[PDB]
Design a protein around this nucleic acid. Structure first.
Lengths: 283, 124, 116, 124, 283, 283
DNA sequence: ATTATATTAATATTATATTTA
């Protein structure tokens, strides 16, 4: 179980593609309406970490939460028929099953999952809780509409021989999504989030943009990862100014940004040397 | 329902695309695929790539018209729109992305009318 | 029946030819467009316990109707007869009760002006 | 709606093409195919190939005018535009590609006016 | 099934023509609005690879995804009436059909396809996932408008004299589209992407610009292909700096670029010799 | 149907006239803006080949695509009322009509045409696909403005004196347009491009600059034609270096070029003798 | 517990000499 507080400043961008796209709006990434800054949900990073763990582990005591056919009720029923089948008086039986799943699953240990379906077994508050990403420069939506020379269903097929199904494939030129996140210790002591799991989560956050790739997302990479390791479980200084110390603004006289040569990540670690640490894993 | 003194880049860009589409439609009634069926897909995002070919094809579309005074009126309203368009931007903001289509359909409605465009042209 | 008449006139929505939905929609069938799937998961404090009281007494409709109809409209990805009429009734009652200022009351047919 | 001190290459290039088209139109009202119906298709991309013949045909177009002072005013505004044009580039950028048409229609609107070009020429 | 990670740096240009045209813009190639760099989608390279396979194979167990006369629903129904017609309990039946299609099709094995139409059979995540190309020097659009001395339809535009239908045929003078792409191993082990299929895909990527040609695209060629072969399935170093090591900038005092004699492909393989390899197939 | 790959290096110049002139620019030939090299589209060579076939054939099974008085919709409707009028189920009916037109037309068999108007009948990918020509030495535009002593329409200049209508007639002093082109085999097997059609196309490419002449184009001739005949349908070596082996640069200490006595066509067939052939038809 | 499915509008902006020891 970990005992220190970690305030990591995850920074990641996108070369050309659709990172965290919005089902609410067709196929465009989440962008700020009033300004234009791109937004990326934390569930995308969580799924990238899960895929990295699935491809760089394959062992027990670190379940990865299977895809599609993985019914949550079936997994809950399978985890219930272990040490606390019935002889535990429902109440503490749920807590025992939750502890067993935390010791067995890695997704529920690092983040969390819903285990209150049919056979209830409590819920996990979760230690590490990432936030929604947000860029600084107002990004623009390119919208790269592409075509296909093969129809899907015969009903929507044309009355001729030219069977085409176009559509749109949105893309993004740039946008350093300044992600945020905080890690607690009280819930980590209950879920069993040890330091080895924390190091594995850091390695996943660092090297998830090298394997989890597709045609819609294109090419994505992680810039830097400045973790603010504390000293105790108390609160020294508000995290607002702590995360504001690593500001990311524009460089010289430029309108937009295209790569890392147009951003100036101002890192001035001067007032955060009281009872806090600093490490660089991605940058 | 059209604001010609909004001083918005998206408004004038949409109005310009609308009058371009109107000119292309007036050039030939039996038109299958107009510019809106291909040029509008990236007009509000990459205007500097589509509006160049648009202005290149505009004089030929005006010469294709059977009436020469109609082309004169269309160029006059084109320039009255582009008065507030000090420059063609690289990419439009979300608000400007919406104002593009706003001005487009506003200018299309203002053009497809009985006595309106000619009435505004007479006071010039 | 003045409260019922006002509630159903505020619930009067556009209907096409040979429509399965009647001119006046039943209240459980109207709430079924706001529940999860079957008319049983509604909130028994602000939905099936307060909407009936607000309709049978010509009271003010709560914002819970707005939010539930919005969630089920952008969730089911379609607006069938039931959710739009409820929102029209809410807007009309909020205009009539001062809970809505800049907008105005809606009519049965399509409002080609509105300017909203 | 025209910026004469923008110091942009596309702006002055478009203004020059616009005044050239205005001169060709003033040379003869019964003109069928102007320069814009052929020269504008590659004016913003290959200006060094079209503007050469444009400057070659400019003096004959000015001499074709019935009024000699009009040609003087047109040459004066041509040079006032080309003041900021230090050189004819090989190919214009996308931003410059849009600024070409921007300045073109801006100068066309400024020219097709009652008292504007002559008023600016009087203060010189 | 492959076991190594490949980070190839595909480099290809265009002599004179329209390579990857139209994000719905008429007939112009995808270019950066803020700057001017040309962009090429990965689906063009995928279709070129498919055409190369169709012209250099003609055998079973390597389906090429037919052109216009190929309804996806019909192909899915034909692949369903094989070994798992109905006696497989829907759930695992979809996975069995997906595995059969991966063992039979080459496009779904290397990249992927949509198999969730009428008779659903799951979906393929895809191992090899190319990205959108992007040039370095801001290219310019030539726009070579050409004519035709023969009208198409009998509309009112067909004059009594010269029945002409002009239009525009856009062209590009140069632009080394610095393409990118990553290859995974976890999905390759499920789809059956063996090393022979990987070698065939490399040969296709190398020799696709010699057969797949047309009048609109003109003449296109592939410069170099520097594949970064890893050693395991884990993540050694971020791929951002790995792809940044092979930078392509301008040469001496020149404004634009016309051929290979104006570019200086700086290849300094110095820090990538830890646990990675390097090979040259196209360059 | 042909089975070998042909990479011909077409070389042709212009004595005095306007070869491939640009409608986008008045009446000047397509030239490179950044440098000054003249460019010639492939449609001009295709039309010259069509005219040569029209003047050296006059027979069936080799349609030449008629000139101004040839509506494409009328020709498509005439070709539809043959063997597949309606009893063919639209889908394969389009393919049958396309095959019939390929066996009947020569332009669609060698190059291609649009057959997707009203009565759709598919489209032809086309085997032989020429590219846009490009010279080496930066050519200069002469612009030979000439006059006329006879007015055309009753405009504003036909007053009292000599009714004159001048204008410009652009000319070019020299410029060996180094044309390029590739021939495939997969599409040739479907379109029926036999070896006799290939020989006819070679003869047309050789002897098209002797009949297709006019006053605007002046005098044009074809220098050499080095066809790179392969051995199979696969890809041996990239065509970039193959076409770069026949370089054309300047001779001795000269500024420009006027005729063939100022160019030095360096032909060093040394490394192309692996699995490829070489023939000379024009040079 | 659907509906529906055929074309608006189109005739000319502008147009009179910088500077010359």
């Amino acid at each position: 179980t970990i005992e220190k507080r970690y305030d990591f400043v995850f920074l990641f961008d996108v070369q050309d593609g659709n990172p965290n796209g919005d089902p609410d709006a067709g196929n465009l990434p989440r962008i700020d309406p009033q300004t234009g800054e791109g937004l990326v949900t934390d569930v995308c990073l969580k799924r990238k970490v899960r895929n990295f763990i699935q491809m760089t582990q394959n062992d027990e005591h670190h379940d990865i939460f299977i895809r599609e056919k993985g019914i949550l009720n079936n997994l809950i029923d399978e985890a219930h028929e272990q040490e606390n089948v019935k002889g535990k008086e429902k109440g503490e039986k749920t807590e025992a099953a939750r502890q067993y799943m935390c010791s067995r699953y890695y997704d529920i240990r690092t983040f969390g999952a819903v285990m209150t379906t049919g056979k209830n077994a409590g819920q996990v508050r979760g230690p590490v809780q990432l936030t929604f990403s947000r860029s600084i420069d107002p990004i623009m939506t390119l919208e790269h509409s592409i075509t296909r020379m093969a129809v899907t269903n015969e009903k929507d097929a044309s009355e001729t021989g030219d069977n085409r199904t176009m559509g749109r494939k949105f893309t993004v030129p740039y946008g350093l999504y300044r992600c945020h996140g905080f890690i607690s210790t009280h819930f980590a002591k209950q879920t069993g989030f040890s330091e080895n799991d924390l190091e594995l989560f850091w390695q996943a956050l660092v090297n998830m943009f090298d394997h989890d790739h597709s045609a819609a997302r294109g090419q994505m990479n992680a810039r830097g990862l400045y973790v603010f390791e504390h000293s105790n479980n108390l609160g020294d200084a508000p995290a607002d100014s702590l995360f504001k110390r690593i500001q990311v603004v524009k460089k010289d006289g430029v309108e937009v940004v295209r790569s890392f040569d147009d951003y100036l990540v101002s890192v001035d670690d001067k007032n955060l040397e009281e009872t806090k640490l600093l490490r660089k894993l991605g940058g | 329902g059209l604001d010609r003194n909004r001083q918005d880049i998206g408004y004038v860009l949409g109005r310009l695309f609308a009058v371009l589409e109107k000119i292309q439609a007036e050039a030939n009634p039996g038109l299958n695929a107009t510019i809106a069926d291909r040029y509008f897909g990236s007009a509000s995002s990459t205007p500097i790539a589509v509006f160049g070919t648009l202005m290149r094809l505009l004089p030929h579309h005006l010469n294709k018209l059977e009436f020469e005074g109609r082309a004169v009126q269309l160029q006059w309203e084109i320039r009255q729109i582009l008065e507030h368009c000090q420059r063609f931007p690289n990419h439009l903001n979300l608000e400007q992305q919406g104002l593009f289509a706003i001005g487009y359909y506003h200018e299309t409605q203002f053009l497809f009318t009985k006595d309106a465009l000619k009435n505004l042209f007479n006071e010039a | 029946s003045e409260s019922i008449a006002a509630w159903y006139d505020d619930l009067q929505m556009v209907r096409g030819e040979n429509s399965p939905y009647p001119e006046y929609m039943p209240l459980p069938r109207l709430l079924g467009n706001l529940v999860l799937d079957g008319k049983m998961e509604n909130l028994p404090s602000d939905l099936i316990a307060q909407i009936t009281d607000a309709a049978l007494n010509n009271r003010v409709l709560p914002v819970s109707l707005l939010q539930a109809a919005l969630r089920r409209n952008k969730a089911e990805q379609k607006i069938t007869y039931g959710r739009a009429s409820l929102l029209k009734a809410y807007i009309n009652r909020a205009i009539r009760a001062g809970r809505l200022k800049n907008m105005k009351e809606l009519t049965m047919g399509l409002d080609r002006n509105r300017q909203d």
